[PDB]
Amino acid sequence: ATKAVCVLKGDGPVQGIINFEQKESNGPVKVWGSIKGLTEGLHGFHVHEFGDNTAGCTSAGPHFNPLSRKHGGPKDEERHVGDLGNVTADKDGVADVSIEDSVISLSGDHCIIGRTLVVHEKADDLGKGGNEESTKTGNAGSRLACGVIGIA
């Protein structure tokens, strides 16, 4: 049972904690926590490639894409590894994240420890938008809060 954690901070007021857990190797990952300070609605949720926050959330680079694929919702098969789709913030701007994904891992070639979790401005269109940008970033808009994923 490997655990991991991330603390999301930004320039704006957005901030939260997201925990990872992976019972079995190369198994599935439980991802859970709470982001507060969001605009009510949907927000793109991504693991970007680098754990670099020197120029803030910009340094995180692109979505984690070790297999060199196009963008997609987490349920699709054409997807980046760090493409986790969208989180929902309520009338109080709090998103209670509760995901379970089976592509990202805490170990091996798909390991995200040392990479950056990022909550985005708008909503990820899951690649179904119909312009070149939707197949890369998914038009999730700019980056609101980020953090390096560390070990627990």
Partner: nanobody, 114 residues
Framework: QLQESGGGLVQPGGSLRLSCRAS????????MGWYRQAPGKQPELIAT?????????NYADPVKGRFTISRNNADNMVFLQMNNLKPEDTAVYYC?????????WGQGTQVTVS
């Protein structure tokens, strides 16, 4: 739960304004989109609106620079302002959320360009 209106029959080059009233429960995802079920095709997403405040619009390549999406937060409404209509835009325009699991489609509105 999703109610469209505002299509009709228009000469090429014309303009229309589609209007959709959505449930509070759907609208408060603030990620809404106008899909067009293109002739014999599956509904393609043509324009999105998400974000804070009055929101931010994103246009699929065939309409970019001719369609404008917008919303009215107090009224749970979404509007698609279509200008310079080409023949190709003939279809039935549905309105629905994007980026999550879709709601049962509404009736949609008929847009005919000839």
């Amino acid at each position: 739960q999703l109610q469209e209106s505002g299509g009709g029959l228009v000469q090429p080059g014309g303009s229309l304004r589609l209007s959709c009233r959505a449930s509070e429960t759907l609208f408060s995802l603030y990620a809404m989109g106008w899909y067009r079920q293109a002739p014999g095709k599956q509904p393609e997403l043509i324009a999105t609106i998400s974000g804070g405040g009055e929101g931010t619009g994103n246009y699929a390549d065939p309409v970019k620079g001719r369609f404008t999406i917008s919303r009215n937060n107090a009224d749970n409404m979404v509007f698609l302002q279509m200008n310079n209509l080409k023949p190709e835009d003939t279809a039935v325009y549905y309105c629905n959320v994007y980026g999550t699991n879709l709601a049962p489609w509404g009736q949609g509105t008929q847009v005919t360009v000839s």
